[PDB]
Motif scaffolding. Structure first.
Motif, PDB file in Angstrom:
ATOM      1  N   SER A  30     -53.614 -47.269  25.941  1.00 42.92           N
ATOM      2  CA  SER A  30     -52.649 -46.641  25.386  1.00 42.92           C
ATOM      3  C   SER A  30     -52.725 -46.485  23.750  1.00 42.92           C
ATOM      4  N   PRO A  31     -52.295 -45.160  23.353  1.00 46.84           N
ATOM      5  CA  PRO A  31     -52.246 -45.126  21.868  1.00 46.84           C
ATOM      6  C   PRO A  31     -50.631 -45.512  21.691  1.00 46.84           C
ATOM      7  N   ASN A  32     -49.836 -45.829  22.687  1.00 44.34           N
ATOM      8  CA  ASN A  32     -48.309 -46.060  22.684  1.00 44.34           C
ATOM      9  C   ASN A  32     -48.404 -47.565  22.333  1.00 44.34           C
ATOM     10  N   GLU A  33     -47.914 -47.892  21.131  1.00 46.78           N
ATOM     11  CA  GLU A  33     -47.945 -49.400  20.754  1.00 46.78           C
ATOM     12  C   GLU A  33     -46.745 -49.987  21.728  1.00 46.78           C
ATOM     13  N   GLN A  34     -45.775 -49.496  21.986  1.00 46.26           N
ATOM     14  CA  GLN A  34     -44.808 -50.112  22.721  1.00 46.26           C
ATOM     15  C   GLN A  34     -45.332 -50.465  24.222  1.00 46.26           C
TER      16      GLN A  34
HETATM   17 CA   LIG Z   1     -49.245 -44.955  18.393  1.00 43.90          CA
END
Ligand SMILES: [Ca+2]
Ligand SMILES: [Ca+2]
Ligand SMILES: [Ca+2]
Ligand SMILES: [Ca+2]
Ligand SMILES: [Ca+2]
Ligand SMILES: [Ca+2]
Length: 300
Positions: free
Chosen positions: A223-227
């Motif tokens: 995922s590019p979503n760090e969370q």
């Molecule tokens: Ca990101």
């Protein structure tokens, strides 16, 4: 202080305006930290608030729920006072309410009670909350689903017997299915829930593996979503805290290559969590899994 006794008396007022007003003030005072919560408990508020969970007046009920939820955001002893006043049977019955607002507030109050110590969590389980909470994982109402997920997650932040209750109630298949959710709020919560179940003993970790969590958890390492990335790392890190069979299942799902690559991520928290998870997979020991609790307020 000196106005609190009157507010508590007014919870039984024949004037509905005076009642609703006193209830709202108590709800608000209970937003102000554990000393303020204790002032409310010490003035004798709890028996009345619990009685009002049986009210057929939805305005009163919603405010009573709000107040009790806020009191249950306090210390474990404050949570235990709420349980001791008898709140749980009423709250659990409210999980069957056809009123979505009442249901939402009931869930939040239960979740807060289940953010206490293991004994508080066990009271929630013993009151029968789990079958209803697992059934609500199937709700098409995102708001309801989100609050039920938080309650389950908190219950799974207890000891191994509490975690086992969650597993035995059949939560895992729905939770694993939720790892496919396009909804980032739901995804995050499903990851908290699974991480907490994977914070128990090796056979609890293995139930998570056997329910099929790993391939989705490994996919989320992309995922590019760090969370979401951090949340998937936490879950994998908890699973990698088990014994050899658990570590080996993680290796078979392809996690090694990805965990190693993530040590080069610019975000220092991701870097560190990746390194820790990798060290556990290649370690000969066990343990080091993390549990998390959520407390929420209700300010009307
Ligand atoms: Ca990101
Ligand atoms: Ca009246
Ligand atoms: Ca009514
Ligand atoms: Ca309805
Ligand atoms: Ca919907
Ligand atoms: Ca989305």
């Amino acid at each position: 202080g000196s106005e609190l006794p009157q507010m508590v008396q007014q919870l039984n007022s024949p004037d509905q305006q005076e009642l609703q007003s006193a209830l709202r003030k108590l709800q608000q005072i209970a937003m102000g930290g554990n000393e303020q919560i204790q002032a409310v408990i010490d003035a004798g508020a709890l028996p009345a608030l619990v009685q009002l969970l049986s009210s057929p007046n939805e305005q009163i009920l919603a405010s009573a729920l709000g107040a009790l939820a806020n009191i249950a955001s306090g210390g474990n002893e404050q949570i235990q006072a709420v349980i001791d006043a008898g709140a749980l049977p009423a709250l659990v019955q409210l999980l069957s309410s056809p009123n979505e607002q009442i249901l939402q507030f009931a869930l939040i109050a239960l979740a807060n009670i289940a953010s206490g110590g293991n004994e508080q969590i066990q009271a929630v389980i013993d009151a029968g909350a789990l079958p209803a909470l697992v059934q609500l994982l199937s709700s098409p109402n995102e708001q309801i689903l989100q609050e039920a997920l938080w309650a389950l997650s908190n219950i799974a932040s207890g000891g191994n017997e509490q975690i086992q209750a969650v597993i035995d109630a059949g939560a895992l298949p729905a939770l694993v299915q939720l790892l496919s959710s396009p909804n980032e709020q739901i995804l995050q919560e499903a990851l908290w829930a699974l991480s907490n179940i994977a914070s128990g003993g090796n056979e609890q970790i293995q139930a998570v593996i056997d329910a099929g969590a790993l391939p989705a958890l490994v996919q989320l390492l992309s995922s590019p979503n760090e969370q979401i990335l951090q949340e998937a790392l936490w879950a994998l890190s908890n699973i990698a805290s088990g014994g050899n069979e658990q570590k080996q299942a993680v290796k078979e799902a392809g996690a090694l290559e990805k965990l190693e690559q993530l040590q080069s991520h610019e975000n220092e928290k991701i870097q560190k969590e990746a390194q820790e998870a990798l060290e556990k997979l290649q370690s000969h020991g066990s343990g080091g899994s993390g549990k998390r609790k959520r407390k929420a307020k209700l300010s009307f």
